[PDB]
Structure 1
Amino acid sequence: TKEGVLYVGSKTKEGVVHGVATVAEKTKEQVTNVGGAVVTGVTAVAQKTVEGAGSIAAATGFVKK
């Protein structure tokens, strides 16, 4: 009934990858928030599947009071 194919094929000679960098000097509040996965690579694949009537996905930095 439901079918799916994902095909990734890659060739490279040289690859340099810098993923997620968070840097702070003298700061008070700094937030990095990722609701999914973090994937970093010469070849990078992220696949997510959710099956269900009432799926809730929520992602927020910060809540005060």
Structure 2
Amino acid sequence: GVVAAAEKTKQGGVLYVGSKTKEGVVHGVATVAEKTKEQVTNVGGAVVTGVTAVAQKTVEGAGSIAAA
């Protein structure tokens, strides 16, 4: 077996982004493996997919992951 965990606590801005380009297909995070036993896809913190996508002050939480 395995264990993992996280928590957040607390005890105590402009940005200009315009998209312009003629094409984009986007894959955020991705993998392949043929003839494979233990294909495990894991994602944490913040990740987002968009042909434009923005991360102001984005992760104030916390986290961790494990596998196999």
Which TM-score applies when normalising by structure 2?
0.45
Q: Which runs of 5+ in 1 are unaligned?
A: 60-65
Higher strand proportion:
1
Q: 1:35 aligns with which of 31, 40, 44?
A: 44
> Relative contact order: is structure 1 or structure 2 higher (C-alpha 8 Å, sep ≥ 6)?
2
Partner SS for 2:23: strand
State the 4+ residue runs in structure 1 displaced beyond 3 angstroms.
47-59
Which TM-score applies when normalising by structure 1?
0.46
User: How does 1:3-22 map onto structure 2 within 5 Å?
Assistant: 4-22=13-31
When the two structures are aligned, how many residues end up with a matched partner? 59
Identity %: 98
For residues 1-29 of structure 1, give each alpha carbon's deviation from its aligned partner in whole angstroms, at most 9, with x where no partner exists: 99922331221222222332222322222
Q: Which runs of 5+ in 2 are unaligned?
A: 1-8
RMSD: 5.8
Query: Structure 1 residue 45: deviation in Å?
Result: 1.3
For residues 32-58 of structure 1, give each alpha carbon's deviation from its aligned partner in whole angstroms, at most 9, with x where no partner exists: 322223322221113445669999999
